[model samples]
Target: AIIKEFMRFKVHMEGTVNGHEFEVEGKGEGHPYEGFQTVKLKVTKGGPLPFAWDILSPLVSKAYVKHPADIPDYFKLSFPEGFKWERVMNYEDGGVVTVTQDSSLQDGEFIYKVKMRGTNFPSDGPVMQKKTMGWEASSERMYPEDGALKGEVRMRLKLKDGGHYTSEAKTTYKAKKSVLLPGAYIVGIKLDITSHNEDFTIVEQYERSEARHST
Candidate 1:
């Protein structure tokens, strides 16, 4: 991955995987690749562990909670009758933006645009719109007595309204039987992005935001 600054409050990124290359439009403040694989992220006002972990869990359930043990054979069962579960990651935050590369497969790239407010939910210090994206029948975190092992999720924390954040998280480790590979029961995990905005308009997206220019 490569990062370059071209303007104020804007940053550009370019990434290559499996020999394929893609670029992000004009740049921003800094390099945001701390937790590239399993990015655990939280944004606060002061700095360094600024957010409260205790008050944030309930707000961001699935990813934050460990249920693979309690939920027996969770990944074994199929999703609901009408539902389809795909292997994916939706790392969207209210005040951040993220893009991921899938080179080994033909899944193309994944993008995220999460939005939040400082006082909407879990309103102690900042509202947390936590999100975790993985293979789930429906876009829900809680599950029945059977347990939550069958589901996958990524937590998103919403800090402020219109405030933005993004996470470039990769879900590499999946249940062996659950992965969809060649000659496999499924065609590999199909990644999907979840949206709550009307008409899926304000929903997250994956697009090229930059162009090569003569310097």
Candidate 2:
């Protein structure tokens, strides 16, 4: 005989004959807002041959493996990709923009830089006057402090007609931390963008989460 109990994200069973406990946990990777379908399982003793043990044994055997086959495409990339399409400027004024990040650094902080070049200058004008634009950005991960990440970006530009514009924006991001089966810790973060002013629109959103671990 056997008795079974259900808990959030996991299941527990007790054997009447052996007096042992068997737990099957649901492990998965991706943003919590969408879904959490476990792709792996974790199994441990106090039982030799528990009921329904063989059904999930195969999944438990490969519990430590991180498989992205079932994960959705939205939770795939950590860093934004592509060159020309990374940032789009569709204002009344048009220009070519460039962005760069120090992704080579592995162990410290991270920062990004942005540059814009006006292309509507007069056919015959001074090079310095025509190329009058600059941009800068900075970002940092403030973990264990308040469990939040912060960043800011600034832009300054000079039009061909002797006009100028400047703007600065900042954001503070927060994430959640949880413990998974098999002694794994995961930090999940989801980002959304909305505009207070009609002049602005959110062209893209970012999502990220840390995977599981094993002993």
Candidate 3:
């Protein structure tokens, strides 16, 4: 009845009724003040209802793949039996420095040192007077699945305004999920930086990076 009020034009219906079929098309005339009552009928159905389709079925069924360029710099480095490493530098809020250090043991560790350098950290807004400085050190294993290279990670960094932070974590890098398709595995990392001033703080975050390695 409510649907008919907005659809002022005539309507047609065609379907089955009892053991037979029927077709009806009609329109109402005149105003509500007239002596005639409006005819409204409830709808009835039989058999099973139709199902709505899921649009995301194809996306969810997609297979995962690993690319070589997406691998981290540490995983690509080779640390021989002795102390070996390489230095990587980049220009940023001043500059950035990194080194890939390796060990001599059969299943030694791979280390990475990331540092922020210089005092030219330019800023916009009320906190423009503050400088910039920070550093992070991380150590990982060469052959993680073997268990010979256990797990130990350390990191420390200092902000421009004399604030420092440190954290230690233990990890075992092995796939816990059972997979039917053989492919590479991935470990993701993310970092967030918040700079505080007298009244307000500026916050920035590094997006998560997915670095996949082969099985």
Q: Using TM-score as the measure, which candidate wins?
A: 3
Task: Put down candidate 3 lDDT per residue, 1-215, tens digits, no spaces.
Answer: 11111111122333331132333232222121111112121112322111100100000100011124543223222222222323322223332223322222232221211111122223341113323243442332223334222233343444455764343333322222221222334433323332322322112222122334635
In candidate 2, stretches whose alpha carbon ends up further than 4 angstroms from where it belongs are 1-85, 90-93, 98-104, 109-162, 165-215
User: What is the lDDT, from 0 to 100, of the residue 144 in candidate 3?
Assistant: 37
Write the residue-wise lDDT of candidate 2 on 122-196 in tens digits.
233322223332222212121222333332334344444565443332333222232111211223322222111
How should the candidates be ordered by TM-score, best one leading?
Answer: 3, 2, 1
C-alpha TM-scores of all predictions: 0.19, 0.20, 0.23
Instruction: Note the Cα lDDT for every prediction shown.
Output: 0.23, 0.25, 0.26
Cα RMSDs of all predictions?
18.5, 25.3, 30.4
Q: Model 1 off-target regions past 4 Å?
A: 1-74, 77-156, 176-215
TM-score of 3: 0.23
TM-score: which is higher, 2 or 3?
3
Worst 10 residues of 2 by lDDT: 1-10
